[PDB]
A paper describes a structure:
[name] and [name] share an N-terminal domain architecture comprising an N-terminal [name] followed by ~300 residues with high coiled-coil propensity, referred to as the coiled-coil domain. Upon activation, both [name] and [name] recruit the same downstream binding partner, B-cell lymphoma/leukemia 10 (Bcl10), which interacts through its own [name] with the [name] of [name] or [name], a [name]–[name] interaction critical for subsequent signal propagation and NF-κB activation.
With this sample, we were able to generate a 4.0-Å reconstruction of the [name] [name] filament. The coiled-coil domain is disordered relative to the [name] core, such that the reconstruction contains only [name] residues 8–95. The [name] adopts the canonical helical architecture of a death domain, with helical symmetry of a 5.11 Å rise and 101.6° left-handed rotation, consistent with a growing body of literature demonstrating a narrow range of parameters adopted by helical assemblies of CARDs (4.85–5.13 Å rise and 100.2°−101.6° left-handed rotation) including that of Bcl1036,38–41. As is typical of this architecture, the [name] utilizes three [name]-[name] interfaces, known as the Type I, Type II, and Type III interfaces, corresponding to the 3-, 4-, and 1-start helical symmetries, respectively.
Residue numbers in the entry:
A (entry chain J), B (entry chain I), C (entry chain H), D (entry chain B), E (entry chain E), F (entry chain G), ...: 8 to 95
Amino acid sequence: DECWSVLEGFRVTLTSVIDPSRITPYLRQCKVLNPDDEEQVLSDPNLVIRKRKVGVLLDILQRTGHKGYVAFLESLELYYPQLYKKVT
Amino acid sequence: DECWSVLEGFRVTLTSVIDPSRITPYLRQCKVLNPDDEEQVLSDPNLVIRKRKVGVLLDILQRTGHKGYVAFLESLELYYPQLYKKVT
Amino acid sequence: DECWSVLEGFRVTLTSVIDPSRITPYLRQCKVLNPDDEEQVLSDPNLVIRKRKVGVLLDILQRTGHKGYVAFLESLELYYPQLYKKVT
Amino acid sequence: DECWSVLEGFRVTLTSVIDPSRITPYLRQCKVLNPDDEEQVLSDPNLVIRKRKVGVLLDILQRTGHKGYVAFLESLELYYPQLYKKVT
Amino acid sequence: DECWSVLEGFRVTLTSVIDPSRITPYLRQCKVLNPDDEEQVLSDPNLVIRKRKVGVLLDILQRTGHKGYVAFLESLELYYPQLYKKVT
Amino acid sequence: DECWSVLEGFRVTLTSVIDPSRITPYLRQCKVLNPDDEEQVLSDPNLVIRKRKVGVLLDILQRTGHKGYVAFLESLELYYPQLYKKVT
Amino acid sequence: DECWSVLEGFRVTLTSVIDPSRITPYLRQCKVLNPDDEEQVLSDPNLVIRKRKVGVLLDILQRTGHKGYVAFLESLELYYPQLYKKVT
Amino acid sequence: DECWSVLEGFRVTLTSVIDPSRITPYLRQCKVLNPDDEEQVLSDPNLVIRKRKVGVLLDILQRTGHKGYVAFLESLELYYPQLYKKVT
Amino acid sequence: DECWSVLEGFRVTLTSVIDPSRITPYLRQCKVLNPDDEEQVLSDPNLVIRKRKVGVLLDILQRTGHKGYVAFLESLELYYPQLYKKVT
Amino acid sequence: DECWSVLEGFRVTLTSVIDPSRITPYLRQCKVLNPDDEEQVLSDPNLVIRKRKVGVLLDILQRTGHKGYVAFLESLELYYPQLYKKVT
């Protein structure tokens, strides 16, 4: 691992800003997630504030390592450039 | 029994393809299920992926024998013909 | 007590017909229940058929006596008149 | 007694098919069980497979005689007719 | 006897694999055990590893002869076929 | 310790007001909790009133000392200022 | 003592009505119980009917005297006023 | 005495039917038993079948006379009416 | 055996990554598990962190040998290829 | 030995803080414990406070020497760093 245990250093910022409906497909084509986990992220009558969703998604990525990390990171510097800069 | 213990031979295919919101009423009129089990299949804040639902429904039918089997089978060859062919 | 041990004589009818989302507030203002018990009745990922809910609510009222009985009864003859008639 | 010691002749079938959440209230109004035993049947973090539950319930009825037997039997021929036929 | 004193030749395999919560009812209907011994097998705050339980059950059957032996054996070839094959 | 054994002096107020879904991430980045304990706090089909949850969370923090105390305290004076004032 | 040996005069009423999940925290801040005894009251896979729980809690308070008595009593006249009146 | 030496005439029926967790508190308030004997009845890792428990309890009552007899009897005609009728 | 006693060499990785709701059906059709064990894995109000679940499932497979091992292994190289590579 | 007889110098701190459900698997792969002892640690209807559990586990490790000591120690400095520092 060695990467998530540090990126997590700041998580409130992400959980507040980022949104899933854009990140999901690019990841999907970089072959990380499966359909089921996506539908669990999005359609669920229990978690609604939009923040629990990001929490679940970010944890599902943490369960995977370097690969999913790179996918997430590249997606991020492609969509949210100033946030990527803040990360680095 | 003698029937479910073989039809189960292939279950992934069904659990992936089939969906409940169509099968439920035809069965309902062939007098197998009750309202309560139907609402349990559908409205439940715990199981969401759409696959656990099919699992529960298929098990509720397994709990009953030849009768429910014939109902399910006829419904299936009425809606999903190529899948019925695959079964046979 | 002397009242619930007889009203219980017929319970299937109630558990089938009545629904909580209407009875709850009127009781709430007749000062019987507390918020916590209400949320336990309604939001719980274990009991879903709508009938276990009525069971729990009716038992929570049985735990209290004449007071809650009168509250429930008056609510009932205010909302469900023909069912009240059946009770009497 | 003279009745349970024979009905027990076939118990696997029942323990597999029957379910409690329907039988419980009708019995409850035929005045056999008490609340405590019901909650013990249902809410218990030790026994989960759904079969131990039916075992406990059926034994609690065996502890009582002709009365509970008739209650159980009538409930059964009211809900599960083909299973009643199998019994007779 | 003449049967248990040989079947015991291999006991570790059974005590490791088999589990009671399935065998118990079929035996129960073949009229070997009584309720009390069953509850002693299962609910006891002293023996917990799951292996002492099988030990006690298997000994309770040894206390009885040909009859209980046949019951156990038939149950076994009905549930655990490859284990029955290993026995024979 | 020397701190929790006094802050506990008033606990009803907290257990009534505070809610977890906001406190959890800030703590998470101050590196106190782990994912598992978080999921135990939130997703559990036994404890539902919202108060047992706060109880468990507050105890999990008590199990840790000065560090978790400071984290909790700073989070609190960042989100709930008047409640922090009441604490001091 | 001189107090519990009389309050016990009526115990069925309490053991039926009262519930722990509300009384526990107020007592906890009046510094009577410890965490361990609380978790023993609540989470235990042996005692389930809700009544054994109240029994254990009430005995744990009896083990302590005037102090715990006053705590329990004040909690009670704060939550259950008509029951307090019945006590007096 | 003159009473127990006759009521004992039929003991199997009681030892089979009755259960302690209900009788114990009413007796407790009629001031017959002490806490210690109650805990001995219930929590003991040696006697488990539920029948030895009733045996011990019934003997502890026999050790006392007319008083405990009346307590037991009244409790019984309050909970188990048909069994009381069988006694008389 | 000779296989599990080595595959266990690394267990933290699996217990962290793998999840049951996907593995369960494929195994189910390779005829290893029974319904009861599946429901025990999934629906149980005691074990919640998602890790105890994998522990129980993996042990239930260990109780069986070469057969269940091959089933698990093939499922794994069908769903989680990089994890299979890590295994080999 | 020469190691446990000193580490025991402070035991209250450990028995209060540490928890088993995390330590168990890492040890399990360092090949110290067996399944049976693990299930005895966790699932037992007698010991519940969470502290007796740690006591039993720590003693089971003491029964083994240098090997289990090193396993426990490394696990600890991998999960609980500040507690490891306190140890050293």
